[PDB]
Amino acid sequence: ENLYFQSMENFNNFYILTSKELGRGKFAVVRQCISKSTGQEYAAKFLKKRRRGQDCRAEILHEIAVLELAKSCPRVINLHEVYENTSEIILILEYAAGGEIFSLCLPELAEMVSENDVIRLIKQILEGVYYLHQNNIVHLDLKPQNILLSSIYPLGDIKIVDFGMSRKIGHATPEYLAPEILNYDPITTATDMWNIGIIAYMLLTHTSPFVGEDNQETYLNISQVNVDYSEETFSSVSQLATDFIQSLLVKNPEKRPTAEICLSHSWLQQWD
Ligand SMILES: Nc1ncnc2c1ncn2[C@@H]1O[C@H](COP(=O)(O)OP(=O)(O)O)[C@@H](O)[C@H]1O
Ligand SMILES: [Mg+2]
């Protein structure tokens, strides 16, 4: 096996690693690194080329092709360089200092995020999805863990990441799965819109809308679209926001609005 991308020696020459691990999957790790020339912080995603005994180098090239396609889009993370060694392909990514948007979905920070801030973040997440949908790209993993912030004090901008599941239209955690995934119905752009309803639901209420005691109850709630819309949970959430979410959390994908229509919802129109 020959190496396509730059050599690992160049990486150790231009960049220094730190002890800071930003994320760790099964076959991927994200460590922080700094440029020896400029002292700028970057994020290095090490991806293993062999997963479960399969040479997965092709899928990594697919994820690079997608990142490269959406470089002009600022709602998508920027790819700067690529390096490769015997077992790893390394992606040098724009650093997102704010971290996962998952942080704001916790009651521990509900006191600093106002409805006006969610409107701005939701509007930003849509502009990225719109761009991706313009180019027949579907993310499929739009979970709060794969949506980051450029900062937190003050709240920064959106940066989408993790394109390991990006396909084209019409292709082949439980709580973030759409109901048409459980029916095996073909993929569709509307599948990403279901996940945006959960992001908005999780930010405004600070609770997951479908997770149950065990996975059995989780899958049931999804396939039944059983969501908690009670007054106790929405007593301090606008009705416009509710209309926005309910229009997205519906079982039939063809009924969910597109990314273009969502930007026209009366909830997102206000001088900020
Ligand atoms: N550019 C980045 N800046 C800061 N943190 C990142 C960045 N990219 C990824 N992370 C962190 O690493 C975690 C996992 O990265 P990800 O691209 O989703 O790989 P995977 O899902 O395959 O494990 C993310 O949830 C995020 O917390
Ligand atoms: Mg992830």
PDB file of C-alpha atoms and ligand atoms in Angstrom:
ATOM      1  CA  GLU A   1       0.000   0.000   0.000  1.00  0.00           C
ATOM      2  CA  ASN A   2       1.358   3.385  -1.105  1.00  0.00           C
ATOM      3  CA  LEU A   3       0.571   6.741   0.490  1.00  0.00           C
ATOM      4  CA  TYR A   4      -1.373   9.315  -1.520  1.00  0.00           C
ATOM      5  CA  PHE A   5      -1.307  12.356   0.765  1.00  0.00           C
ATOM      6  CA  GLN A   6       1.659  14.168   2.309  1.00  0.00           C
ATOM      7  CA  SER A   7       4.065  12.204   4.494  1.00  0.00           C
ATOM      8  CA  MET A   8       3.834  11.952   8.271  1.00  0.00           C
ATOM      9  CA  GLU A   9       7.317  13.482   8.510  1.00  0.00           C
ATOM     10  CA  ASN A  10       5.970  16.764   7.126  1.00  0.00           C
ATOM     11  CA  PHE A  11       3.241  16.779   9.782  1.00  0.00           C
ATOM     12  CA  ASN A  12       5.721  16.451  12.655  1.00  0.00           C
ATOM     13  CA  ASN A  13       7.747  19.235  10.983  1.00  0.00           C
ATOM     14  CA  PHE A  14       4.954  21.826  10.659  1.00  0.00           C
ATOM     15  CA  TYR A  15       2.667  20.924  13.574  1.00  0.00           C
ATOM     16  CA  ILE A  16       2.986  20.042  17.245  1.00  0.00           C
ATOM     17  CA  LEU A  17       0.402  17.930  19.030  1.00  0.00           C
ATOM     18  CA  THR A  18      -1.020  18.736  22.453  1.00  0.00           C
ATOM     19  CA  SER A  19      -2.408  16.644  25.294  1.00  0.00           C
ATOM     20  CA  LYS A  20      -5.903  17.939  24.448  1.00  0.00           C
ATOM     21  CA  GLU A  21      -8.207  15.280  23.005  1.00  0.00           C
ATOM     22  CA  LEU A  22     -11.278  16.973  21.521  1.00  0.00           C
ATOM     23  CA  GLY A  23     -13.086  13.752  20.619  1.00  0.00           C
ATOM     24  CA  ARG A  24     -12.542  10.009  20.375  1.00  0.00           C
ATOM     25  CA  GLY A  25     -14.624   7.604  18.311  1.00  0.00           C
ATOM     26  CA  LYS A  26     -14.075   3.936  17.575  1.00  0.00           C
ATOM     27  CA  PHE A  27     -11.818   4.392  14.524  1.00  0.00           C
ATOM     28  CA  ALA A  28     -11.129   8.133  14.761  1.00  0.00           C
ATOM     29  CA  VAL A  29      -9.493  10.513  17.239  1.00  0.00           C
ATOM     30  CA  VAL A  30      -9.406  14.316  17.222  1.00  0.00           C
ATOM     31  CA  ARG A  31      -6.427  15.978  18.907  1.00  0.00           C
ATOM     32  CA  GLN A  32      -5.483  19.645  19.047  1.00  0.00           C
ATOM     33  CA  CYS A  33      -2.388  20.827  17.192  1.00  0.00           C
ATOM     34  CA  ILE A  34      -0.615  24.132  16.578  1.00  0.00           C
ATOM     35  CA  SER A  35       1.268  25.440  13.545  1.00  0.00           C
ATOM     36  CA  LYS A  36       4.954  25.970  14.294  1.00  0.00           C
ATOM     37  CA  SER A  37       4.998  28.816  11.752  1.00  0.00           C
ATOM     38  CA  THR A  38       1.998  30.854  12.926  1.00  0.00           C
ATOM     39  CA  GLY A  39       1.034  29.462  16.334  1.00  0.00           C
ATOM     40  CA  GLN A  40      -2.550  29.060  15.119  1.00  0.00           C
ATOM     41  CA  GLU A  41      -4.698  26.325  16.643  1.00  0.00           C
ATOM     42  CA  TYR A  42      -6.087  23.600  14.381  1.00  0.00           C
ATOM     43  CA  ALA A  43      -7.975  20.334  14.842  1.00  0.00           C
ATOM     44  CA  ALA A  44      -6.389  17.107  13.579  1.00  0.00           C
ATOM     45  CA  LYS A  45      -8.740  14.179  12.910  1.00  0.00           C
ATOM     46  CA  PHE A  46      -6.851  10.883  12.691  1.00  0.00           C
ATOM     47  CA  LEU A  47      -8.915   8.318  10.769  1.00  0.00           C
ATOM     48  CA  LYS A  48      -7.940   4.655  10.596  1.00  0.00           C
ATOM     49  CA  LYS A  49      -7.787   3.167   7.102  1.00  0.00           C
ATOM     50  CA  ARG A  50      -8.773  -0.356   8.245  1.00  0.00           C
ATOM     51  CA  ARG A  51     -12.076  -0.722  10.115  1.00  0.00           C
ATOM     52  CA  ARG A  52     -13.254  -4.212  11.090  1.00  0.00           C
ATOM     53  CA  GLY A  53     -10.766  -5.734   8.661  1.00  0.00           C
ATOM     54  CA  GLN A  54     -11.920  -3.626   5.696  1.00  0.00           C
ATOM     55  CA  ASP A  55      -9.704  -1.151   3.845  1.00  0.00           C
ATOM     56  CA  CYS A  56     -11.876   1.945   4.328  1.00  0.00           C
ATOM     57  CA  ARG A  57      -9.515   4.372   2.566  1.00  0.00           C
ATOM     58  CA  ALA A  58     -12.182   4.941  -0.099  1.00  0.00           C
ATOM     59  CA  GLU A  59     -14.770   6.202   2.398  1.00  0.00           C
ATOM     60  CA  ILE A  60     -12.250   8.677   3.806  1.00  0.00           C
ATOM     61  CA  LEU A  61     -11.634  10.024   0.299  1.00  0.00           C
ATOM     62  CA  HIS A  62     -15.413  10.394   0.036  1.00  0.00           C
ATOM     63  CA  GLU A  63     -15.464  12.442   3.251  1.00  0.00           C
ATOM     64  CA  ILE A  64     -12.598  14.591   1.945  1.00  0.00           C
ATOM     65  CA  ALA A  65     -14.406  15.185  -1.355  1.00  0.00           C
ATOM     66  CA  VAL A  66     -17.452  16.452   0.549  1.00  0.00           C
ATOM     67  CA  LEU A  67     -15.486  18.746   2.866  1.00  0.00           C
ATOM     68  CA  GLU A  68     -13.704  20.148  -0.192  1.00  0.00           C
ATOM     69  CA  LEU A  69     -17.018  20.755  -1.957  1.00  0.00           C
ATOM     70  CA  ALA A  70     -18.406  22.880   0.896  1.00  0.00           C
ATOM     71  CA  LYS A  71     -15.275  24.923   1.611  1.00  0.00           C
ATOM     72  CA  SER A  72     -16.851  28.160   0.371  1.00  0.00           C
ATOM     73  CA  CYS A  73     -19.671  27.639   2.886  1.00  0.00           C
ATOM     74  CA  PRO A  74     -18.780  29.189   6.280  1.00  0.00           C
ATOM     75  CA  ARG A  75     -21.364  27.083   8.123  1.00  0.00           C
ATOM     76  CA  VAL A  76     -19.178  24.068   7.258  1.00  0.00           C
ATOM     77  CA  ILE A  77     -15.813  23.334   8.840  1.00  0.00           C
ATOM     78  CA  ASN A  78     -12.783  24.228   6.732  1.00  0.00           C
ATOM     79  CA  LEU A  79     -10.272  21.612   5.570  1.00  0.00           C
ATOM     80  CA  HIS A  80      -6.740  23.020   5.320  1.00  0.00           C
ATOM     81  CA  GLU A  81      -4.381  20.065   4.797  1.00  0.00           C
ATOM     82  CA  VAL A  82      -4.311  16.270   4.644  1.00  0.00           C
ATOM     83  CA  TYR A  83      -1.513  13.943   5.771  1.00  0.00           C
ATOM     84  CA  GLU A  84      -1.238  10.161   5.733  1.00  0.00           C
ATOM     85  CA  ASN A  85       0.786   7.430   7.417  1.00  0.00           C
ATOM     86  CA  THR A  86       0.679   3.628   7.392  1.00  0.00           C
ATOM     87  CA  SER A  87      -2.641   3.292   9.226  1.00  0.00           C
ATOM     88  CA  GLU A  88      -4.047   6.827   9.420  1.00  0.00           C
ATOM     89  CA  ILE A  89      -5.284   9.664   7.242  1.00  0.00           C
ATOM     90  CA  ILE A  90      -5.032  13.010   9.042  1.00  0.00           C
ATOM     91  CA  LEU A  91      -7.358  15.951   8.382  1.00  0.00           C
ATOM     92  CA  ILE A  92      -6.250  19.412   9.529  1.00  0.00           C
ATOM     93  CA  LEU A  93      -9.510  21.230  10.262  1.00  0.00           C
ATOM     94  CA  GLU A  94     -10.456  24.750  11.265  1.00  0.00           C
ATOM     95  CA  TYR A  95     -10.586  24.865  15.058  1.00  0.00           C
ATOM     96  CA  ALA A  96     -13.977  25.352  16.730  1.00  0.00           C
ATOM     97  CA  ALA A  97     -13.249  26.897  20.127  1.00  0.00           C
ATOM     98  CA  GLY A  98     -16.871  26.897  21.298  1.00  0.00           C
ATOM     99  CA  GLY A  99     -17.187  23.123  21.245  1.00  0.00           C
ATOM    100  CA  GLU A 100     -20.243  20.994  20.652  1.00  0.00           C
ATOM    101  CA  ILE A 101     -23.634  22.680  20.526  1.00  0.00           C
ATOM    102  CA  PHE A 102     -24.669  19.746  22.737  1.00  0.00           C
ATOM    103  CA  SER A 103     -23.444  21.857  25.662  1.00  0.00           C
ATOM    104  CA  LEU A 104     -26.326  24.327  25.387  1.00  0.00           C
ATOM    105  CA  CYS A 105     -28.899  21.503  25.426  1.00  0.00           C
ATOM    106  CA  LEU A 106     -28.119  20.856  29.102  1.00  0.00           C
ATOM    107  CA  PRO A 107     -30.056  22.576  31.920  1.00  0.00           C
ATOM    108  CA  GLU A 108     -26.668  23.624  33.326  1.00  0.00           C
ATOM    109  CA  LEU A 109     -26.444  26.440  30.739  1.00  0.00           C
ATOM    110  CA  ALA A 110     -30.126  27.222  30.084  1.00  0.00           C
ATOM    111  CA  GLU A 111     -29.636  30.478  32.015  1.00  0.00           C
ATOM    112  CA  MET A 112     -27.416  32.097  29.357  1.00  0.00           C
ATOM    113  CA  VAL A 113     -29.150  31.034  26.110  1.00  0.00           C
ATOM    114  CA  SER A 114     -32.243  33.072  25.249  1.00  0.00           C
ATOM    115  CA  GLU A 115     -34.835  32.323  22.590  1.00  0.00           C
ATOM    116  CA  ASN A 116     -33.252  35.089  20.504  1.00  0.00           C
ATOM    117  CA  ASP A 117     -29.970  33.140  20.520  1.00  0.00           C
ATOM    118  CA  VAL A 118     -31.565  29.868  19.391  1.00  0.00           C
ATOM    119  CA  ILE A 119     -33.222  31.705  16.496  1.00  0.00           C
ATOM    120  CA  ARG A 120     -29.788  32.871  15.351  1.00  0.00           C
ATOM    121  CA  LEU A 121     -28.176  29.439  15.693  1.00  0.00           C
ATOM    122  CA  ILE A 122     -31.088  27.656  14.002  1.00  0.00           C
ATOM    123  CA  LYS A 123     -30.971  30.154  11.135  1.00  0.00           C
ATOM    124  CA  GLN A 124     -27.243  29.445  10.767  1.00  0.00           C
ATOM    125  CA  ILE A 125     -27.638  25.655  10.863  1.00  0.00           C
ATOM    126  CA  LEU A 126     -30.201  25.953   8.058  1.00  0.00           C
ATOM    127  CA  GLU A 127     -27.983  28.038   5.771  1.00  0.00           C
ATOM    128  CA  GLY A 128     -25.408  25.252   5.923  1.00  0.00           C
ATOM    129  CA  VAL A 129     -27.952  22.496   5.322  1.00  0.00           C
ATOM    130  CA  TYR A 130     -29.422  24.543   2.470  1.00  0.00           C
ATOM    131  CA  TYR A 131     -26.004  24.725   0.805  1.00  0.00           C
ATOM    132  CA  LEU A 132     -25.490  20.991   1.319  1.00  0.00           C
ATOM    133  CA  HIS A 133     -28.952  20.274  -0.094  1.00  0.00           C
ATOM    134  CA  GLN A 134     -28.353  22.555  -3.079  1.00  0.00           C
ATOM    135  CA  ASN A 135     -25.523  20.173  -4.035  1.00  0.00           C
ATOM    136  CA  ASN A 136     -27.500  16.946  -3.453  1.00  0.00           C
ATOM    137  CA  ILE A 137     -25.609  16.240  -0.211  1.00  0.00           C
ATOM    138  CA  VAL A 138     -27.313  14.736   2.846  1.00  0.00           C
ATOM    139  CA  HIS A 139     -25.547  14.643   6.217  1.00  0.00           C
ATOM    140  CA  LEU A 140     -27.609  11.985   8.073  1.00  0.00           C
ATOM    141  CA  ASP A 141     -25.701  12.565  11.337  1.00  0.00           C
ATOM    142  CA  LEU A 142     -27.041  16.013  12.291  1.00  0.00           C
ATOM    143  CA  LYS A 143     -26.778  15.411  16.018  1.00  0.00           C
ATOM    144  CA  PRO A 144     -25.703  18.099  18.515  1.00  0.00           C
ATOM    145  CA  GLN A 145     -22.368  16.295  18.918  1.00  0.00           C
ATOM    146  CA  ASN A 146     -21.520  16.967  15.243  1.00  0.00           C
ATOM    147  CA  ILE A 147     -22.456  20.682  15.282  1.00  0.00           C
ATOM    148  CA  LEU A 148     -19.858  22.966  16.866  1.00  0.00           C
ATOM    149  CA  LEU A 149     -19.511  26.627  17.825  1.00  0.00           C
ATOM    150  CA  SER A 150     -16.726  29.006  16.843  1.00  0.00           C
ATOM    151  CA  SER A 151     -16.845  30.407  20.402  1.00  0.00           C
ATOM    152  CA  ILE A 152     -19.055  30.546  23.491  1.00  0.00           C
ATOM    153  CA  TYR A 153     -18.216  33.853  25.225  1.00  0.00           C
ATOM    154  CA  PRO A 154     -19.864  35.430  23.297  1.00  0.00           C
ATOM    155  CA  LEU A 155     -21.875  32.809  21.412  1.00  0.00           C
ATOM    156  CA  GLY A 156     -20.119  32.305  18.092  1.00  0.00           C
ATOM    157  CA  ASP A 157     -21.154  30.831  14.751  1.00  0.00           C
ATOM    158  CA  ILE A 158     -22.122  27.361  13.572  1.00  0.00           C
ATOM    159  CA  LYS A 159     -19.642  24.875  12.118  1.00  0.00           C
ATOM    160  CA  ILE A 160     -20.865  21.472  10.881  1.00  0.00           C
ATOM    161  CA  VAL A 161     -18.551  18.447  10.988  1.00  0.00           C
ATOM    162  CA  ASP A 162     -18.526  14.657  10.602  1.00  0.00           C
ATOM    163  CA  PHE A 163     -19.313  13.805   6.966  1.00  0.00           C
ATOM    164  CA  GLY A 164     -18.623  10.077   7.351  1.00  0.00           C
ATOM    165  CA  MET A 165     -22.243   9.335   6.403  1.00  0.00           C
ATOM    166  CA  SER A 166     -22.745  11.875   3.599  1.00  0.00           C
ATOM    167  CA  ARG A 167     -24.263  10.365   0.448  1.00  0.00           C
ATOM    168  CA  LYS A 168     -26.292  11.643  -2.502  1.00  0.00           C
ATOM    169  CA  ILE A 169     -30.078  11.641  -2.688  1.00  0.00           C
ATOM    170  CA  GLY A 170     -31.963   8.370  -3.025  1.00  0.00           C
ATOM    171  CA  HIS A 171     -29.229   6.187  -1.490  1.00  0.00           C
ATOM    172  CA  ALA A 172     -29.646   3.071   0.676  1.00  0.00           C
ATOM    173  CA  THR A 173     -27.393   7.068  18.332  1.00  0.00           C
ATOM    174  CA  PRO A 174     -30.968   5.716  18.359  1.00  0.00           C
ATOM    175  CA  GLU A 175     -32.566   8.861  19.797  1.00  0.00           C
ATOM    176  CA  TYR A 176     -31.475  10.932  16.772  1.00  0.00           C
ATOM    177  CA  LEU A 177     -32.811   8.518  14.131  1.00  0.00           C
ATOM    178  CA  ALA A 178     -35.656   9.523  11.827  1.00  0.00           C
ATOM    179  CA  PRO A 179     -38.832   7.432  11.507  1.00  0.00           C
ATOM    180  CA  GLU A 180     -38.236   6.692   7.816  1.00  0.00           C
ATOM    181  CA  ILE A 181     -34.954   5.047   8.837  1.00  0.00           C
ATOM    182  CA  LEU A 182     -36.910   2.498  10.875  1.00  0.00           C
ATOM    183  CA  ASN A 183     -39.169   1.776   7.881  1.00  0.00           C
ATOM    184  CA  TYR A 184     -36.092   1.335   5.631  1.00  0.00           C
ATOM    185  CA  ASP A 185     -37.696   3.876   3.267  1.00  0.00           C
ATOM    186  CA  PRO A 186     -35.099   5.451   0.944  1.00  0.00           C
ATOM    187  CA  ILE A 187     -33.043   8.348   2.253  1.00  0.00           C
ATOM    188  CA  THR A 188     -34.244  11.876   1.544  1.00  0.00           C
ATOM    189  CA  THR A 189     -33.234  15.458   2.266  1.00  0.00           C
ATOM    190  CA  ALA A 190     -36.231  15.596   4.621  1.00  0.00           C
ATOM    191  CA  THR A 191     -34.325  13.183   6.882  1.00  0.00           C
ATOM    192  CA  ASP A 192     -31.920  15.975   7.838  1.00  0.00           C
ATOM    193  CA  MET A 193     -34.921  18.189   8.602  1.00  0.00           C
ATOM    194  CA  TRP A 194     -36.148  15.721  11.234  1.00  0.00           C
ATOM    195  CA  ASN A 195     -32.819  16.112  13.046  1.00  0.00           C
ATOM    196  CA  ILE A 196     -33.121  19.905  12.940  1.00  0.00           C
ATOM    197  CA  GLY A 197     -36.438  19.616  14.766  1.00  0.00           C
ATOM    198  CA  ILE A 198     -34.636  17.724  17.530  1.00  0.00           C
ATOM    199  CA  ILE A 199     -31.828  20.294  17.725  1.00  0.00           C
ATOM    200  CA  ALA A 200     -34.394  23.071  18.169  1.00  0.00           C
ATOM    201  CA  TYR A 201     -36.415  20.949  20.604  1.00  0.00           C
ATOM    202  CA  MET A 202     -33.286  20.127  22.604  1.00  0.00           C
ATOM    203  CA  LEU A 203     -32.076  23.742  22.763  1.00  0.00           C
ATOM    204  CA  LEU A 204     -35.389  25.288  23.854  1.00  0.00           C
ATOM    205  CA  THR A 205     -36.460  22.582  26.326  1.00  0.00           C
ATOM    206  CA  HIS A 206     -33.024  21.161  27.263  1.00  0.00           C
ATOM    207  CA  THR A 207     -34.294  17.574  27.018  1.00  0.00           C
ATOM    208  CA  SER A 208     -34.270  14.899  24.338  1.00  0.00           C
ATOM    209  CA  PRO A 209     -37.721  14.462  22.739  1.00  0.00           C
ATOM    210  CA  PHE A 210     -37.591  10.698  22.064  1.00  0.00           C
ATOM    211  CA  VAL A 211     -35.171   8.983  24.475  1.00  0.00           C
ATOM    212  CA  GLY A 212     -36.969   6.615  26.835  1.00  0.00           C
ATOM    213  CA  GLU A 213     -36.081   4.386  29.755  1.00  0.00           C
ATOM    214  CA  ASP A 214     -34.560   1.800  27.395  1.00  0.00           C
ATOM    215  CA  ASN A 215     -34.045   1.588  23.639  1.00  0.00           C
ATOM    216  CA  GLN A 216     -37.375  -0.209  23.155  1.00  0.00           C
ATOM    217  CA  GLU A 217     -39.314   2.823  24.403  1.00  0.00           C
ATOM    218  CA  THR A 218     -37.002   5.086  22.384  1.00  0.00           C
ATOM    219  CA  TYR A 219     -37.736   3.392  19.054  1.00  0.00           C
ATOM    220  CA  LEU A 220     -41.458   3.297  19.864  1.00  0.00           C
ATOM    221  CA  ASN A 221     -41.635   7.034  20.572  1.00  0.00           C
ATOM    222  CA  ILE A 222     -39.874   7.759  17.267  1.00  0.00           C
ATOM    223  CA  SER A 223     -42.083   5.514  15.128  1.00  0.00           C
ATOM    224  CA  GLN A 224     -45.135   6.980  16.906  1.00  0.00           C
ATOM    225  CA  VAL A 225     -43.890  10.603  16.902  1.00  0.00           C
ATOM    226  CA  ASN A 226     -44.739  10.732  20.621  1.00  0.00           C
ATOM    227  CA  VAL A 227     -43.306  14.079  21.739  1.00  0.00           C
ATOM    228  CA  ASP A 228     -43.826  15.961  25.006  1.00  0.00           C
ATOM    229  CA  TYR A 229     -45.582  19.193  23.998  1.00  0.00           C
ATOM    230  CA  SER A 230     -47.190  19.764  27.408  1.00  0.00           C
ATOM    231  CA  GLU A 231     -47.526  23.184  29.018  1.00  0.00           C
ATOM    232  CA  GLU A 232     -45.057  22.263  31.776  1.00  0.00           C
ATOM    233  CA  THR A 233     -42.301  21.911  29.159  1.00  0.00           C
ATOM    234  CA  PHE A 234     -43.283  24.841  26.903  1.00  0.00           C
ATOM    235  CA  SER A 235     -44.575  27.261  29.552  1.00  0.00           C
ATOM    236  CA  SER A 236     -41.610  29.514  28.684  1.00  0.00           C
ATOM    237  CA  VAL A 237     -41.314  28.781  24.945  1.00  0.00           C
ATOM    238  CA  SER A 238     -43.012  30.895  22.290  1.00  0.00           C
ATOM    239  CA  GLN A 239     -45.829  29.465  20.188  1.00  0.00           C
ATOM    240  CA  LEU A 240     -43.954  30.345  16.988  1.00  0.00           C
ATOM    241  CA  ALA A 241     -41.132  28.058  18.113  1.00  0.00           C
ATOM    242  CA  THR A 242     -43.677  25.296  18.735  1.00  0.00           C
ATOM    243  CA  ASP A 243     -45.183  25.709  15.260  1.00  0.00           C
ATOM    244  CA  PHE A 244     -41.637  25.550  13.893  1.00  0.00           C
ATOM    245  CA  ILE A 245     -40.829  22.248  15.613  1.00  0.00           C
ATOM    246  CA  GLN A 246     -44.150  20.468  15.077  1.00  0.00           C
ATOM    247  CA  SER A 247     -43.962  21.263  11.357  1.00  0.00           C
ATOM    248  CA  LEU A 248     -40.716  19.243  11.296  1.00  0.00           C
ATOM    249  CA  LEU A 249     -41.388  16.344  13.699  1.00  0.00           C
ATOM    250  CA  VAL A 250     -43.856  14.464  11.505  1.00  0.00           C
ATOM    251  CA  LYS A 251     -43.612  10.853  10.376  1.00  0.00           C
ATOM    252  CA  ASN A 252     -44.178  11.487   6.651  1.00  0.00           C
ATOM    253  CA  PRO A 253     -40.948  12.886   5.144  1.00  0.00           C
ATOM    254  CA  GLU A 254     -42.796  14.447   2.198  1.00  0.00           C
ATOM    255  CA  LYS A 255     -44.738  16.670   4.616  1.00  0.00           C
ATOM    256  CA  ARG A 256     -41.651  18.177   6.261  1.00  0.00           C
ATOM    257  CA  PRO A 257     -40.691  21.555   4.764  1.00  0.00           C
ATOM    258  CA  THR A 258     -37.417  21.984   2.939  1.00  0.00           C
ATOM    259  CA  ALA A 259     -34.449  23.976   4.196  1.00  0.00           C
ATOM    260  CA  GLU A 260     -35.557  26.819   1.910  1.00  0.00           C
ATOM    261  CA  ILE A 261     -39.068  26.994   3.381  1.00  0.00           C
ATOM    262  CA  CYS A 262     -37.746  26.813   6.955  1.00  0.00           C
ATOM    263  CA  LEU A 263     -35.781  30.033   6.459  1.00  0.00           C
ATOM    264  CA  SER A 264     -39.160  31.670   5.713  1.00  0.00           C
ATOM    265  CA  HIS A 265     -40.826  30.626   8.983  1.00  0.00           C
ATOM    266  CA  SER A 266     -42.286  33.588  10.864  1.00  0.00           C
ATOM    267  CA  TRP A 267     -40.256  32.515  13.909  1.00  0.00           C
ATOM    268  CA  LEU A 268     -36.916  33.373  12.271  1.00  0.00           C
ATOM    269  CA  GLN A 269     -37.926  36.864  11.053  1.00  0.00           C
ATOM    270  CA  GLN A 270     -36.782  39.592  13.442  1.00  0.00           C
ATOM    271  CA  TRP A 271     -34.158  42.331  13.460  1.00  0.00           C
ATOM    272  CA  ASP A 272     -31.281  40.961  15.547  1.00  0.00           C
TER     273      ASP A 272
HETATM  274  N1  LIG B   1     -12.892  21.024  14.192  1.00  0.00           N
HETATM  275  C1  LIG B   1     -13.157  20.686  15.461  1.00  0.00           C
HETATM  276  N2  LIG B   1     -12.921  21.564  16.460  1.00  0.00           N
HETATM  277  C2  LIG B   1     -13.206  21.176  17.724  1.00  0.00           C
HETATM  278  N3  LIG B   1     -13.700  20.001  18.067  1.00  0.00           N
HETATM  279  C3  LIG B   1     -13.952  19.095  17.101  1.00  0.00           C
HETATM  280  C4  LIG B   1     -13.682  19.423  15.772  1.00  0.00           C
HETATM  281  N4  LIG B   1     -14.018  18.360  15.014  1.00  0.00           N
HETATM  282  C5  LIG B   1     -14.483  17.392  15.836  1.00  0.00           C
HETATM  283  N5  LIG B   1     -14.447  17.835  17.118  1.00  0.00           N
HETATM  284  C6  LIG B   1     -14.831  17.141  18.199  1.00  0.00           C
HETATM  285  O1  LIG B   1     -14.582  15.762  17.990  1.00  0.00           O
HETATM  286  C7  LIG B   1     -15.801  14.985  18.125  1.00  0.00           C
HETATM  287  C8  LIG B   1     -15.833  13.851  17.138  1.00  0.00           C
HETATM  288  O2  LIG B   1     -15.434  14.328  15.873  1.00  0.00           O
HETATM  289  P1  LIG B   1     -16.207  13.714  14.537  1.00  0.00           P
HETATM  290  O3  LIG B   1     -15.801  14.537  13.277  1.00  0.00           O
HETATM  291  O4  LIG B   1     -17.680  13.787  14.737  1.00  0.00           O
HETATM  292  O5  LIG B   1     -15.787  12.182  14.364  1.00  0.00           O
HETATM  293  P2  LIG B   1     -16.560  10.831  14.725  1.00  0.00           P
HETATM  294  O6  LIG B   1     -18.054  11.135  14.905  1.00  0.00           O
HETATM  295  O7  LIG B   1     -16.374   9.850  13.621  1.00  0.00           O
HETATM  296  O8  LIG B   1     -16.007  10.245  16.044  1.00  0.00           O
HETATM  297  C9  LIG B   1     -16.917  15.990  17.829  1.00  0.00           C
HETATM  298  O9  LIG B   1     -18.124  15.606  18.476  1.00  0.00           O
HETATM  299  C10 LIG B   1     -16.340  17.273  18.425  1.00  0.00           C
HETATM  300  O10 LIG B   1     -16.633  17.319  19.822  1.00  0.00           O
HETATM  301 MG    MG B   2     -19.413  12.302  16.338  1.00  0.00          MG
END
